[PDB]
């Protein structure tokens, strides 16, 4: 059991083991606040997230469990993974705080694309790594659902990691038309739509579909990709969605070469494959990695899949204390990475 030191950072109290030195606020995280810290044990610069009211309700307790399970499962270079997880609590009875530890990253893609237009080689490498990371996440039957520039973290040497995958349930600019409108069934390719939007923005320096509401968002989308075809209309079970689509002004699919003028034709070809309205026709992460645009990076022997992931808990209806105890077992059973 380590020695814990107490401090206050922006009205919140942090009780962390002594190895975590020079805690400095970095901003808001998914369901809590994040601090940059120096880990004396590894010499790594780390990001520490203290979850906010982790067991206040069934909803909080289940998502705390969900995030910890996800983080403990992910072991890939382009996917955020767990370096450590701790609680100052000595017993389950006392258990009320969860601190999660991962690598501290240099910047987010949101702040990089404002400093400013990336070269085609830089786009190739960053998009490659997103798709490599999504290939792995998707292989464990996990979907991001809210992939966007603010959850893509990158270092000075251009190494990228995906954060906040598997947490979103139920940013609009990067959202697939089907997951926003609940038309079609939807699959893991909802993240590929997001990749397309991010890639377009990295290449042009401009948001591809900067909508104001769900209706304006669809309008902007259909202006590029065209109104749904007869083959796609056949696949819509929602009578509301169908009536609406058929009511809208018919729009043809624009030629992406005439939109993304100046861009590498291989980037334009990939975008055409990622920005397909029909979720069944959209390119997958594994297929996109073999696209000629990634010729200098693609390595089919270094594009791993994940071990299977047990998501059965998602279907369970348990009490706060049950979710809390399950989280406590996951905290105690944690094994840090090897050297
Ligand atoms: C399972 C998915 N969970 C997950 O990825 N958790 C992330 C996570 C897990 C355990 C410990 C820390 C984090 C965690 C780490 C970090 C950062 C690491 N390096 C950063 N550098 C700055 C300069 C860009 S931010 N940011 C966020 N939230 C950044 C803002 N988001 C988009 C709200 N959460």
GROMACS .gro file of C-alpha atoms and ligand atoms in nm:
model
  373
    1UNK     CA    1   0.000   0.000   0.000
    2UNK     CA    2   0.167   0.329  -0.108
    3UNK     CA    3   0.193   0.656   0.086
    4UNK     CA    4  -0.082   0.897  -0.026
    5UNK     CA    5  -0.050   1.279  -0.025
    6UNK     CA    6  -0.347   1.520  -0.024
    7UNK     CA    7  -0.375   1.850  -0.219
    8UNK     CA    8  -0.644   2.072  -0.371
    9UNK     CA    9  -0.650   2.164  -0.743
   10UNK     CA   10  -0.930   2.398  -0.867
   11UNK     CA   11  -1.163   2.323  -0.565
   12UNK     CA   12  -1.120   1.942  -0.599
   13UNK     CA   13  -0.910   1.736  -0.351
   14UNK     CA   14  -0.649   1.496  -0.507
   15UNK     CA   15  -0.524   1.203  -0.288
   16UNK     CA   16  -0.257   1.032  -0.499
   17UNK     CA   17   0.040   0.796  -0.416
   18UNK     CA   18   0.382   0.974  -0.361
   19UNK     CA   19   0.521   0.842  -0.695
   20UNK     CA   20   0.287   1.085  -0.874
   21UNK     CA   21   0.468   1.419  -0.852
   22UNK     CA   22   0.402   1.781  -0.964
   23UNK     CA   23   0.023   1.747  -1.034
   24UNK     CA   24  -0.082   2.019  -1.279
   25UNK     CA   25  -0.438   2.070  -1.423
   26UNK     CA   26  -0.475   1.983  -1.794
   27UNK     CA   27  -0.853   2.011  -1.834
   28UNK     CA   28  -1.182   1.820  -1.831
   29UNK     CA   29  -1.196   1.446  -1.906
   30UNK     CA   30  -1.480   1.195  -1.967
   31UNK     CA   31  -1.666   1.201  -1.628
   32UNK     CA   32  -1.390   1.382  -1.436
   33UNK     CA   33  -1.085   1.615  -1.429
   34UNK     CA   34  -0.731   1.535  -1.556
   35UNK     CA   35  -0.387   1.632  -1.417
   36UNK     CA   36  -0.041   1.606  -1.582
   37UNK     CA   37   0.199   1.437  -1.333
   38UNK     CA   38   0.553   1.296  -1.322
   39UNK     CA   39   0.574   0.930  -1.230
   40UNK     CA   40   0.895   0.883  -1.024
   41UNK     CA   41   0.875   0.501  -1.060
   42UNK     CA   42   0.888   0.498  -1.442
   43UNK     CA   43   1.013   0.847  -1.528
   44UNK     CA   44   0.701   0.880  -1.750
   45UNK     CA   45   0.501   1.202  -1.779
   46UNK     CA   46   0.146   1.075  -1.703
   47UNK     CA   47  -0.216   1.202  -1.714
   48UNK     CA   48  -0.415   1.129  -1.396
   49UNK     CA   49  -0.800   1.143  -1.419
   50UNK     CA   50  -1.000   1.156  -1.097
   51UNK     CA   51  -1.352   1.036  -1.174
   52UNK     CA   52  -1.632   1.274  -1.060
   53UNK     CA   53  -1.890   1.121  -0.812
   54UNK     CA   54  -1.814   0.771  -0.955
   55UNK     CA   55  -2.080   0.589  -0.748
   56UNK     CA   56  -2.340   0.863  -0.702
   57UNK     CA   57  -2.602   0.674  -0.906
   58UNK     CA   58  -2.642   0.340  -1.095
   59UNK     CA   59  -2.558   0.536  -1.413
   60UNK     CA   60  -2.230   0.666  -1.267
   61UNK     CA   61  -2.137   0.337  -1.106
   62UNK     CA   62  -2.200   0.142  -1.430
   63UNK     CA   63  -2.000   0.391  -1.643
   64UNK     CA   64  -1.711   0.388  -1.388
   65UNK     CA   65  -1.707   0.004  -1.420
   66UNK     CA   66  -1.736   0.031  -1.804
   67UNK     CA   67  -1.444   0.276  -1.835
   68UNK     CA   68  -1.219   0.077  -1.606
   69UNK     CA   69  -1.298  -0.251  -1.790
   70UNK     CA   70  -1.229  -0.086  -2.129
   71UNK     CA   71  -0.905   0.076  -2.019
   72UNK     CA   72  -0.782  -0.252  -1.860
   73UNK     CA   73  -0.853  -0.438  -2.188
   74UNK     CA   74  -0.685  -0.204  -2.440
   75UNK     CA   75  -0.317  -0.296  -2.517
   76UNK     CA   76  -0.230  -0.120  -2.844
   77UNK     CA   77   0.006   0.164  -2.945
   78UNK     CA   78  -0.272   0.386  -3.095
   79UNK     CA   79  -0.522   0.325  -2.818
   80UNK     CA   80  -0.514   0.478  -2.472
   81UNK     CA   81  -0.441   0.209  -2.213
   82UNK     CA   82  -0.415   0.192  -1.834
   83UNK     CA   83  -0.076   0.254  -1.672
   84UNK     CA   84  -0.229   0.251  -1.322
   85UNK     CA   85  -0.557   0.271  -1.128
   86UNK     CA   86  -0.575   0.355  -0.761
   87UNK     CA   87  -0.801   0.459  -0.474
   88UNK     CA   88  -0.697   0.611  -0.137
   89UNK     CA   89  -0.956   0.372   0.020
   90UNK     CA   90  -0.827   0.083   0.234
   91UNK     CA   91  -1.157  -0.111   0.214
   92UNK     CA   92  -1.463  -0.156  -0.015
   93UNK     CA   93  -1.662   0.005   0.271
   94UNK     CA   94  -1.440   0.319   0.240
   95UNK     CA   95  -1.432   0.299  -0.155
   96UNK     CA   96  -1.554   0.627  -0.309
   97UNK     CA   97  -1.281   0.753  -0.543
   98UNK     CA   98  -1.123   0.619  -0.860
   99UNK     CA   99  -0.810   0.761  -1.017
  100UNK     CA  100  -0.702   0.639  -1.360
  101UNK     CA  101  -0.351   0.679  -1.504
  102UNK     CA  102  -0.234   0.682  -1.869
  103UNK     CA  103   0.044   0.845  -2.081
  104UNK     CA  104   0.052   1.224  -2.093
  105UNK     CA  105   0.023   1.321  -2.465
  106UNK     CA  106   0.168   1.643  -2.621
  107UNK     CA  107  -0.144   1.784  -2.787
  108UNK     CA  108  -0.492   1.704  -2.925
  109UNK     CA  109  -0.580   1.710  -3.299
  110UNK     CA  110  -0.825   1.997  -3.232
  111UNK     CA  111  -0.529   2.222  -3.126
  112UNK     CA  112  -0.294   2.087  -3.401
  113UNK     CA  113  -0.534   2.162  -3.693
  114UNK     CA  114  -0.545   2.529  -3.568
  115UNK     CA  115  -0.154   2.540  -3.589
  116UNK     CA  116  -0.253   2.465  -3.884
  117UNK     CA  117  -0.253   2.288  -4.225
  118UNK     CA  118  -0.084   1.950  -4.216
  119UNK     CA  119   0.125   1.814  -4.499
  120UNK     CA  120  -0.013   1.513  -4.695
  121UNK     CA  121   0.260   1.291  -4.535
  122UNK     CA  122   0.149   1.402  -4.185
  123UNK     CA  123  -0.222   1.331  -4.278
  124UNK     CA  124  -0.118   0.985  -4.409
  125UNK     CA  125   0.053   0.890  -4.084
  126UNK     CA  126  -0.211   1.030  -3.842
  127UNK     CA  127  -0.504   0.878  -4.037
  128UNK     CA  128  -0.311   0.549  -4.062
  129UNK     CA  129  -0.264   0.530  -3.685
  130UNK     CA  130  -0.639   0.616  -3.619
  131UNK     CA  131  -0.745   0.332  -3.852
  132UNK     CA  132  -0.484   0.096  -3.695
  133UNK     CA  133  -0.622   0.178  -3.347
  134UNK     CA  134  -0.986   0.144  -3.470
  135UNK     CA  135  -0.902  -0.190  -3.636
  136UNK     CA  136  -0.802  -0.316  -3.289
  137UNK     CA  137  -1.097  -0.156  -3.092
  138UNK     CA  138  -1.352  -0.276  -3.353
  139UNK     CA  139  -1.204  -0.633  -3.334
  140UNK     CA  140  -1.307  -0.646  -2.964
  141UNK     CA  141  -1.670  -0.545  -3.065
  142UNK     CA  142  -1.617  -0.194  -2.921
  143UNK     CA  143  -1.708   0.117  -3.118
  144UNK     CA  144  -1.593   0.473  -3.034
  145UNK     CA  145  -1.926   0.644  -3.145
  146UNK     CA  146  -1.791   0.995  -3.075
  147UNK     CA  147  -1.456   0.996  -3.261
  148UNK     CA  148  -1.348   1.364  -3.307
  149UNK     CA  149  -1.026   1.580  -3.303
  150UNK     CA  150  -1.046   1.649  -2.925
  151UNK     CA  151  -1.021   1.275  -2.847
  152UNK     CA  152  -0.720   1.209  -3.074
  153UNK     CA  153  -0.401   1.284  -2.879
  154UNK     CA  154  -0.060   1.312  -3.042
  155UNK     CA  155   0.311   1.355  -2.949
  156UNK     CA  156   0.594   1.566  -3.113
  157UNK     CA  157   0.708   1.261  -3.313
  158UNK     CA  158   0.345   1.226  -3.453
  159UNK     CA  159   0.254   0.913  -3.252
  160UNK     CA  160  -0.128   0.923  -3.205
  161UNK     CA  161  -0.359   0.761  -2.946
  162UNK     CA  162  -0.745   0.740  -2.941
  163UNK     CA  163  -0.916   0.837  -2.610
  164UNK     CA  164  -1.278   0.806  -2.485
  165UNK     CA  165  -1.386   0.511  -2.705
  166UNK     CA  166  -1.679   0.291  -2.591
  167UNK     CA  167  -1.826   0.549  -2.351
  168UNK     CA  168  -2.080   0.742  -2.569
  169UNK     CA  169  -2.438   0.594  -2.576
  170UNK     CA  170  -2.813   0.657  -2.676
  171UNK     CA  171  -1.975   1.620  -3.138
  172UNK     CA  172  -2.235   1.640  -3.421
  173UNK     CA  173  -1.984   1.770  -3.687
  174UNK     CA  174  -1.808   1.423  -3.703
  175UNK     CA  175  -2.115   1.207  -3.652
  176UNK     CA  176  -2.241   0.951  -3.904
  177UNK     CA  177  -2.579   1.046  -4.056
  178UNK     CA  178  -2.732   0.708  -3.938
  179UNK     CA  179  -2.624   0.729  -3.570
  180UNK     CA  180  -2.747   1.085  -3.539
  181UNK     CA  181  -3.080   1.012  -3.715
  182UNK     CA  182  -3.135   0.638  -3.618
  183UNK     CA  183  -3.230   0.541  -3.983
  184UNK     CA  184  -3.034   0.224  -4.049
  185UNK     CA  185  -2.911  -0.045  -3.810
  186UNK     CA  186  -2.557   0.115  -3.776
  187UNK     CA  187  -2.228  -0.070  -3.725
  188UNK     CA  188  -1.859   0.002  -3.645
  189UNK     CA  189  -1.834   0.206  -3.970
  190UNK     CA  190  -1.996   0.495  -3.776
  191UNK     CA  191  -1.630   0.558  -3.669
  192UNK     CA  192  -1.510   0.542  -4.034
  193UNK     CA  193  -1.752   0.830  -4.119
  194UNK     CA  194  -1.583   1.022  -3.830
  195UNK     CA  195  -1.232   0.940  -3.973
  196UNK     CA  196  -1.348   1.077  -4.314
  197UNK     CA  197  -1.460   1.406  -4.153
  198UNK     CA  198  -1.137   1.438  -3.952
  199UNK     CA  199  -0.918   1.354  -4.257
  200UNK     CA  200  -1.109   1.610  -4.477
  201UNK     CA  201  -1.044   1.877  -4.208
  202UNK     CA  202  -0.672   1.786  -4.168
  203UNK     CA  203  -0.631   1.820  -4.549
  204UNK     CA  204  -0.833   2.147  -4.601
  205UNK     CA  205  -0.794   2.321  -4.262
  206UNK     CA  206  -1.179   2.357  -4.253
  207UNK     CA  207  -1.464   2.164  -4.077
  208UNK     CA  208  -1.630   1.946  -4.345
  209UNK     CA  209  -1.989   1.963  -4.210
  210UNK     CA  210  -2.021   2.249  -3.952
  211UNK     CA  211  -2.395   2.202  -3.879
  212UNK     CA  212  -2.606   2.396  -3.623
  213UNK     CA  213  -2.860   2.123  -3.538
  214UNK     CA  214  -2.936   1.765  -3.648
  215UNK     CA  215  -3.142   1.892  -3.954
  216UNK     CA  216  -2.875   2.140  -4.073
  217UNK     CA  217  -2.609   1.869  -4.018
  218UNK     CA  218  -2.794   1.621  -4.247
  219UNK     CA  219  -2.851   1.900  -4.509
  220UNK     CA  220  -2.472   1.977  -4.516
  221UNK     CA  221  -2.398   1.606  -4.541
  222UNK     CA  222  -2.647   1.533  -4.824
  223UNK     CA  223  -2.516   1.841  -5.019
  224UNK     CA  224  -2.183   1.652  -5.050
  225UNK     CA  225  -2.280   1.280  -5.060
  226UNK     CA  226  -2.622   1.321  -5.229
  227UNK     CA  227  -2.975   1.235  -5.107
  228UNK     CA  228  -3.023   0.855  -5.036
  229UNK     CA  229  -3.061   0.633  -5.341
  230UNK     CA  230  -3.346   0.383  -5.395
  231UNK     CA  231  -3.121   0.096  -5.267
  232UNK     CA  232  -3.061   0.290  -4.943
  233UNK     CA  233  -3.428   0.392  -4.901
  234UNK     CA  234  -3.515   0.014  -4.904
  235UNK     CA  235  -3.292  -0.027  -4.595
  236UNK     CA  236  -3.468   0.235  -4.375
  237UNK     CA  237  -3.716   0.074  -4.122
  238UNK     CA  238  -3.801   0.409  -3.948
  239UNK     CA  239  -4.122   0.537  -4.130
  240UNK     CA  240  -4.045   0.890  -3.985
  241UNK     CA  241  -3.686   0.898  -4.130
  242UNK     CA  242  -3.811   0.760  -4.466
  243UNK     CA  243  -4.100   1.015  -4.502
  244UNK     CA  244  -3.854   1.297  -4.419
  245UNK     CA  245  -3.576   1.187  -4.660
  246UNK     CA  246  -3.830   1.153  -4.949
  247UNK     CA  247  -3.968   1.502  -4.862
  248UNK     CA  248  -3.621   1.676  -4.885
  249UNK     CA  249  -3.493   1.854  -5.201
  250UNK     CA  250  -3.315   1.591  -5.418
  251UNK     CA  251  -2.938   1.645  -5.425
  252UNK     CA  252  -2.682   1.463  -5.643
  253UNK     CA  253  -2.354   1.320  -5.511
  254UNK     CA  254  -2.076   1.574  -5.570
  255UNK     CA  255  -1.744   1.468  -5.726
  256UNK     CA  256  -1.496   1.478  -5.428
  257UNK     CA  257  -1.203   1.564  -5.673
  258UNK     CA  258  -1.386   1.896  -5.740
  259UNK     CA  259  -1.436   1.952  -5.363
  260UNK     CA  260  -1.093   1.856  -5.227
  261UNK     CA  261  -0.909   2.031  -5.515
  262UNK     CA  262  -0.530   2.018  -5.481
  263UNK     CA  263  -0.543   1.709  -5.253
  264UNK     CA  264  -0.363   1.376  -5.328
  265UNK     CA  265  -0.596   1.161  -5.553
  266UNK     CA  266  -0.535   0.864  -5.319
  267UNK     CA  267  -0.664   1.086  -5.024
  268UNK     CA  268  -0.969   1.184  -5.242
  269UNK     CA  269  -1.027   0.811  -5.335
  270UNK     CA  270  -1.011   0.705  -4.964
  271UNK     CA  271  -1.251   0.988  -4.861
  272UNK     CA  272  -1.503   0.866  -5.126
  273UNK     CA  273  -1.483   0.516  -4.964
  274UNK     CA  274  -1.519   0.651  -4.602
  275UNK     CA  275  -1.793   0.907  -4.676
  276UNK     CA  276  -2.055   0.663  -4.813
  277UNK     CA  277  -2.410   0.724  -4.675
  278UNK     CA  278  -2.489   0.347  -4.684
  279UNK     CA  279  -2.327   0.196  -4.364
  280UNK     CA  280  -2.310  -0.148  -4.539
  281UNK     CA  281  -2.103   0.003  -4.826
  282UNK     CA  282  -1.859   0.212  -4.614
  283UNK     CA  283  -1.497   0.089  -4.593
  284UNK     CA  284  -1.395  -0.081  -4.266
  285UNK     CA  285  -1.081   0.006  -4.062
  286UNK     CA  286  -0.903  -0.318  -4.174
  287UNK     CA  287  -0.992  -0.251  -4.540
  288UNK     CA  288  -0.888   0.117  -4.520
  289UNK     CA  289  -0.541   0.023  -4.382
  290UNK     CA  290  -0.472  -0.170  -4.713
  291UNK     CA  291  -0.571   0.138  -4.922
  292UNK     CA  292  -0.280   0.263  -5.150
  293UNK     CA  293  -0.287   0.598  -4.963
  294UNK     CA  294  -0.113   0.410  -4.673
  295UNK     CA  295   0.154   0.236  -4.891
  296UNK     CA  296   0.453   0.382  -4.696
  297UNK     CA  297   0.303   0.281  -4.356
  298UNK     CA  298   0.082  -0.030  -4.411
  299UNK     CA  299   0.224  -0.347  -4.259
  300UNK     CA  300  -0.033  -0.636  -4.244
  301UNK     CA  301   0.196  -0.817  -3.990
  302UNK     CA  302   0.189  -0.519  -3.748
  303UNK     CA  303  -0.186  -0.433  -3.748
  304UNK     CA  304  -0.311  -0.648  -3.460
  305UNK     CA  305  -0.660  -0.736  -3.341
  306UNK     CA  306  -0.764  -0.745  -2.974
  307UNK     CA  307  -0.821  -1.041  -2.745
  308UNK     CA  308  -1.204  -1.097  -2.713
  309UNK     CA  309  -1.376  -0.861  -2.469
  310UNK     CA  310  -1.652  -0.965  -2.233
  311UNK     CA  311  -1.924  -0.695  -2.256
  312UNK     CA  312  -2.199  -0.917  -2.095
  313UNK     CA  313  -2.223  -0.667  -1.798
  314UNK     CA  314  -2.374  -0.408  -2.036
  315UNK     CA  315  -2.698  -0.610  -2.038
  316UNK     CA  316  -2.709  -0.635  -1.654
  317UNK     CA  317  -2.934  -0.433  -1.414
  318UNK     CA  318  -2.747  -0.411  -1.080
  319UNK     CA  319  -2.751  -0.188  -0.772
  320UNK     CA  320  -2.496   0.093  -0.698
  321UNK     CA  321  -2.312  -0.124  -0.436
  322UNK     CA  322  -2.295  -0.419  -0.677
  323UNK     CA  323  -2.144  -0.198  -0.956
  324UNK     CA  324  -1.914  -0.036  -0.692
  325UNK     CA  325  -1.790  -0.382  -0.564
  326UNK     CA  326  -1.730  -0.501  -0.925
  327UNK     CA  327  -1.527  -0.181  -0.984
  328UNK     CA  328  -1.337  -0.251  -0.653
  329UNK     CA  329  -1.249  -0.607  -0.772
  330UNK     CA  330  -1.118  -0.453  -1.102
  331UNK     CA  331  -0.910  -0.197  -0.909
  332UNK     CA  332  -0.750  -0.467  -0.689
  333UNK     CA  333  -0.698  -0.726  -0.969
  334UNK     CA  334  -0.496  -0.469  -1.178
  335UNK     CA  335  -0.152  -0.571  -1.309
  336UNK     CA  336   0.070  -0.282  -1.436
  337UNK     CA  337   0.249  -0.317  -1.776
  338UNK     CA  338   0.582  -0.511  -1.799
  339UNK     CA  339   0.934  -0.373  -1.879
  340LIG     C1  340  -1.216   0.389  -2.229
  340LIG     C2  341  -1.207   0.533  -2.282
  340LIG     N1  342  -1.157   0.619  -2.175
  340LIG     C3  343  -1.047   0.694  -2.198
  340LIG     O1  344  -0.988   0.697  -2.305
  340LIG     N2  345  -1.008   0.768  -2.090
  340LIG     C4  346  -0.899   0.864  -2.102
  340LIG     C5  347  -0.812   0.861  -1.978
  340LIG     C6  348  -0.814   0.735  -1.904
  340LIG     C7  349  -0.734   0.722  -1.784
  340LIG     C8  350  -0.656   0.836  -1.742
  340LIG     C9  351  -0.653   0.960  -1.812
  340LIG    C10  352  -0.734   0.976  -1.936
  340LIG    C11  353  -0.733   1.104  -2.012
  340LIG    C12  354  -0.605   1.152  -2.053
  340LIG    C13  355  -0.604   1.273  -2.125
  340LIG    C14  356  -0.479   1.336  -2.175
  340LIG    C15  357  -0.350   1.279  -2.186
  340LIG     N3  358  -0.265   1.373  -2.237
  340LIG    C16  359  -0.319   1.494  -2.264
  340LIG     N4  360  -0.242   1.607  -2.319
  340LIG    C17  361  -0.303   1.736  -2.357
  340LIG    C18  362  -0.196   1.842  -2.376
  340LIG    C19  363  -0.369   1.722  -2.494
  340LIG     S1  364  -0.486   1.497  -2.226
  340LIG     N5  365  -0.724   1.337  -2.152
  340LIG    C20  366  -0.844   1.291  -2.112
  340LIG     N6  367  -0.954   1.366  -2.146
  340LIG    C21  368  -0.942   1.460  -2.258
  340LIG    C22  369  -1.076   1.520  -2.298
  340LIG     N7  370  -1.169   1.412  -2.336
  340LIG    C23  371  -1.186   1.411  -2.483
  340LIG    C24  372  -1.298   1.442  -2.271
  340LIG     N8  373  -0.850   1.175  -2.043
   0.00000   0.00000   0.00000
